[PDB]
């Protein structure tokens, strides 16, 4: 199995535009959204077909109730933060919790919060403590660290529960999550050489340029891995051509255990 991850996000907005929801929560398996909830629908719904097909309506009813409670908690927490920052206007509160199951069988787990899109509190499940970025966060840290049982509950959820959910979701969607679509790679001139790959899954891919057998990372322009819209991805990397001397440039692409080399004539 490749490396896989499960994570849940929460977003809260204090003074939202009339149409915008006050609260949003979305879950992901690695790059696929699996679940969604917001303060407008008031319902937790699947966002992947293999989620809806393997979880009975009983499951969505229970978690709809949980998310409704978590929505009110998030609003209370954001109200406290913005009052203690002495901030007026609209401000955002975010949360991310999740876990990774690595290829070698090891696991990781993480939990952190953000205010206005910047790190606010970061959980360390090994030392069972919260890292605070400022004194507003420091006040929250002291209150949360006084509740030792909740810290232990979060450690157990990250290390045991999250990993079990991930393995369960990986089986539900194995046709999507565990498939491999190799990239189609080509080279063209636009002076710089452009190495372009498309049609691949999973999105994880490594593209680089080698000059006479050596890799100069500073000279290479790396493009983003972008969704094509059909479930596959595309990416590119470019390097500038020396007009005064000929060199042997070769593109190297690594994807899902297969290595590719395109030597430029």
């Amino acid at each position, epitope marked *: 199995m490749r490396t896989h991850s499960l994570r849940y996000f929460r977003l809260g907005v204090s003074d939202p535009i009339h149409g915008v929801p006050e609260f949003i929560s979305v879950g992901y398996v690695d790059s696929h959204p699996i679940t969604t909830y917001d303060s407008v629908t008031r319902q937790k719904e699947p966002r992947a077909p293999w989620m809806a097909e393997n979880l009975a309506p009983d499951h969505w009813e229970r978690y709809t109730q949980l998310l409704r409670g978590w929505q009110q*908690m998030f609003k209370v927490e954001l109200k406290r933060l913005q009052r203690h920052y002495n901030h007026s206007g609209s401000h955002t509160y975010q949360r991310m919790i999740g876990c990774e199951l690595l290829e070698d069988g090891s696991t990781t787990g993480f939990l952190q919060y953000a205010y206005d899109g910047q790190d606010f509190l970061i959980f360390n499940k090994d030392t069972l403590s919260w890292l605070a970025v400022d004194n507003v966060a420091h006040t929250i840290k002291q209150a949360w660290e006084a509740n030792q049982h909740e810290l232990l509950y*979060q450690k157990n959820w990250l290390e045991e*529960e999250c990993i079990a959910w991930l393995k369960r979701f990986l089986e539900y969607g194995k046709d999507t999550l565990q498939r491999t679509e190799p990239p189609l790679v080509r080279v063209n001139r636009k002076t710089a050489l452009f190495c372009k790959a498309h049609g691949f899954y999973p999105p994880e891919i490594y593209m680089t340029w080698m000059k006479n057998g050596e890799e100069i990372v500073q000279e290479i322009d790396y493009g983003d891995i972008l969704p094509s819209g059909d479930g596959t991805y595309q990416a590119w990397a470019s390097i500038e051509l020396d007009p005064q001397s000929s060199n042997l440039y070769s593109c190297h692409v690594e994807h899902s255990g297969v290595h590719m080399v395109l030597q430029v004539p």
Partner: antibody, heavy 108, light 116 residues
Framework: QNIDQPTEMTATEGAIVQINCTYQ??????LFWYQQHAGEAPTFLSY??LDGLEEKGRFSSFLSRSKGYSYLLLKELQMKDSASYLC??????????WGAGTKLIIKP | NAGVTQTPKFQVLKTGQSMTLQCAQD?????MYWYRQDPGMGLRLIYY???????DKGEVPNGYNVSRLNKREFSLRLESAAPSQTSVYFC??????????????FGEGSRLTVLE
């Protein structure tokens, strides 16, 4: 999903008693012990979610997640410890599954 | 600081009679629950309210209805009392529902006997 604890236990004043609770649940988010005197409200005693032993006065609670089992240990028993002891487990959906409770009888 | 207060403590009912159990908490909690306790089995949830403005069925909702009137109050209703509803009813509350390690705070209990 089910929780299992003995129906009744009898021990003598001043001795030590261990009340067992085994669970088979869909996921695990913590195990609770509550004390309920006859005709009165249950009150919270302890919470365990990681493995090991936690002490609170004369009462200590142990948990092994791998064996799916916990015990509540009462030392230096007194007559006021006569009560029912309820164990409850939170499953993967944060629902409490309650054991039937153990009635502890203390011989003076 | 009364904690959880439920009434009545005792009530005898004839089959088909209506009955409302009251419960209030003054701990500024958000989650409130109604349990029934019967000999030989663990507590069974009837209805619960994870927060003010939302309720949901528990394990044994049939024959009962609840109304989360506000943050403080959570009433249990038996419209047509049945002999199987002879039980001791416990209302409880917790700070939050999604709080992992949060414990329950129970009321004193209401003993109901329903007779033909």
């Amino acid at each position: 999903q089910n929780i299992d604890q003995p129906t009744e236990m009898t021990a003598t004043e001043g001795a030590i008693v261990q009340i067992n609770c085994t669970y088979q649940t869909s996921g695990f988010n913590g195990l609770f012990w509550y004390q309920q005197h006859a005709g009165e409200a249950p009150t919270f005693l302890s919470y365990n979610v990681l493995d090991g032993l936690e002490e609170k006065g004369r009462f200590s609670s142990f948990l092994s997640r791998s064996k799916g089992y916990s015990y509540l240990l009462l030392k230096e028993l007194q007559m006021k410890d006569s009560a029912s002891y309820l164990c409850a487990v939170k499953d993967s959906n944060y629902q409490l599954i309650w054991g039937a409770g153990t009635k502890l009888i203390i011989k003076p | 600081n009364a904690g959880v207060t439920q009434t009545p403590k005792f009530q005898v009912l004839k089959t088909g009679q209506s009955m409302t159990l009251q419960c209030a908490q003054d701990m500024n909690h958000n989650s409130m629950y109604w349990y029934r306790q019967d000999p030989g089995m663990g507590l069974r949830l009837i209805y619960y309210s994870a927060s003010e403005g939302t309720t949901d069925k528990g394990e044994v909702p049939n024959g009962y209805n609840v109304s989360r009137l506000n943050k403080r109050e959570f009433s249990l209703r038996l419209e047509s009392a049945a002999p199987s509803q002879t039980s001791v009813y416990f209302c409880a509350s917790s700070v939050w529902t999604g709080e992992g390690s949060g414990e329950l705070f129970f009321g004193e209990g209401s003993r109901l006997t329903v007779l033909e």
